[PDB]
Design a protein around this ligand. Structure first.
Ligand SMILES: OC[C@H]1O[C@@](CO)(O[C@H]2O[C@H](CO)[C@@H](O)[C@H](O)[C@H]2O)[C@@H](O)[C@@H]1O
Lengths: 174, 244
């Protein structure tokens, strides 16, 4: 089999190296990679054997001894946030998918501006160094903007019972 | 697209029903694979058929049948449906028997929801909430919210349509939809999505905003008896014009 770290979190516009071991005899066994996006089925990435291989998805470096291998996303974006499987595939079970690596990507938010507004209320413009029974609050979600080149952290809070506590010096206008 | 096609995208049934998931492979392939995936399972292998004959065995519980037909397209039956049988079902295809040299390709997948009573199925309430006047006075930007509320199950695809066109930029939605009564076995779900626009763009009345939600609900082949409207597969939508 193979093993890769459970989770990994890298940054936008960077190369991302996804390591995977296979000290078990990678004989005539091909190193395969498949990815799985937010709410979607698995799709193929790239697959190798004895040498390094390129395609429009990724680059695949394999070790001289082939005991380890490295999936490389040439330049990662919030899009490349997916689940990555490192599979061995050889000859005629064995068509199985491990836990893989929950890859996470974070935006380069230059100017945090924590402020919760009454829209339902909405918490937005905070840093990554922050995270979230009568009320409902949603997990934080980021939104990049073409042309403006600005990525925004936001999480929504709403209840039915009135803008209550849901953060540093956040803005609460009257 | 993935080459592989699969029917149907949505599927809902009461416990102990019998459903058959059809899969037309990649036109050029002779292997078809079936994988079941639940959150508390991940991507599990079920069975593989090469050129019409059975190849790799898996964990197709007795209840499951699988057939590749002469035309290389596969059916997969899942009899006497348990609540645990609720999972995402993936068909796959490959050139030769082993996927060593020539690799796999997955279709978009079937979402099977097995529920205790089809009365559990609910359309989503949908509401676009216009941005705060404060966000503008502070950030010189504007954030619209869309609340999609009270749906079962969570077959929901949200989309934003500004000025009639579909927008992918300035958009953000929760991957996981929020349960409403976390304690209830068959709770209804709620999804939130934001569309941020510039300040001026919101301040323009010529600009129209649409939060649109696809809901994969009940069949037109399912029996219905409630006084309330049938919770069928449908789009619910919220519009909003720009306020000066
Ligand atoms: O017992 C020590 C332990 O360390 C290892 C762990 O992998 O170090 C190796 O790492 C690579 C595996 O991809 C080898 O190719 C490398 O040569 C070696 O240092 C193993 O050797 C060993 O199990």
């Amino acid at each position: 089999k193979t093993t890769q770290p459970n989770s990994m979190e890298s940054n936008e516009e960077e190369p991302v190296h996804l390591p995977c071991n296979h000290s078990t005899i990678s004989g005539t066994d091909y190193i395969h990679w498949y990815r799985q996006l937010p709410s979607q089925g698995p799709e193929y990435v790239i697959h190798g054997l004895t040498s390094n291989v390129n395609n429009r998805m990724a680059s695949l470096a394999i070790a001289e001894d082939r005991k380890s291998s490295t999936l490389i996303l040439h330049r990662a974006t919030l899009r490349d946030a997916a689940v990555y499987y490192c599979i061995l595939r050889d000859g005629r079970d064995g068509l199985t998918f491990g836990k893989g690596t929950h890859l996470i990507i974070q935006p380069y938010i230059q100017n945090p501006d924590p402020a919760v507004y009454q829209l339902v209320c909405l918490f937005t413009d905070f840093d990554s160094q922050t995270n979230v029974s009568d009320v409902y609050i949603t997990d934080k979600c980021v939104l990049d903007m073409r042309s403006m080149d600005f990525k925004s952290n936001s999480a929504v809070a709403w209840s039915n019972k009135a803008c209550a506590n849901a953060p540093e010096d956040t803005f609460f206008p009257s | 697209d993935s080459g592989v096609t699969q029917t149907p995208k949505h599927l809902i049934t009461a416990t102990g029903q019998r459903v058959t998931l059809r899969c037309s492979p990649r036109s050029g392939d002779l292997s078809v694979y079936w994988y079941q995936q639940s959150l508390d399972q991940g991507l599990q292998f079920l069975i593989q058929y090469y050129n019409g004959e059975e190849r790799a065995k898996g964990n197709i519980l007795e209840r499951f049948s699988a057939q590749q037909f002469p035309d290389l397209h596969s059916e997969l039956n899942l009899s006497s449906l348990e609540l645990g049988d609720s999972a995402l079902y993936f068909c796959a295809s490959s050139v030769a028997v082993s996927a060593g040299t020539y690799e796999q390709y997955f279709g978009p997948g079937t979402r099977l929801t097995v529920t205790e009573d089809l009365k559990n199925v609910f359309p989503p309430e949908v509401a676009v909430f216009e941005p705060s006047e404060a966000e503008i006075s502070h950030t010189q930007k504007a954030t619209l919210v869309c609340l999609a509320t009270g749906f079962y199950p969570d077959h929901v695809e949200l989309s934003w349509w500004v000025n009639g066109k579909e927008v992918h930029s300035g958009v953000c939605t929760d991957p996981q939809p929020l349960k409403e009564q976390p304690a209830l076995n068959d709770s209804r779900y709620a999804l939130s999505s934001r569309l941020r626009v510039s300040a001026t763009f919101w301040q323009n009345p010529r600009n129209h905003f649409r939060c649109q939600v696809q809901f994969y609900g009940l069949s037109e082949n399912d029996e219905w008896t409630q006084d309330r409207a049938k919770p069928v597969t449908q789009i619910v939508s919220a519009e909003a014009w720009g306020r000066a």
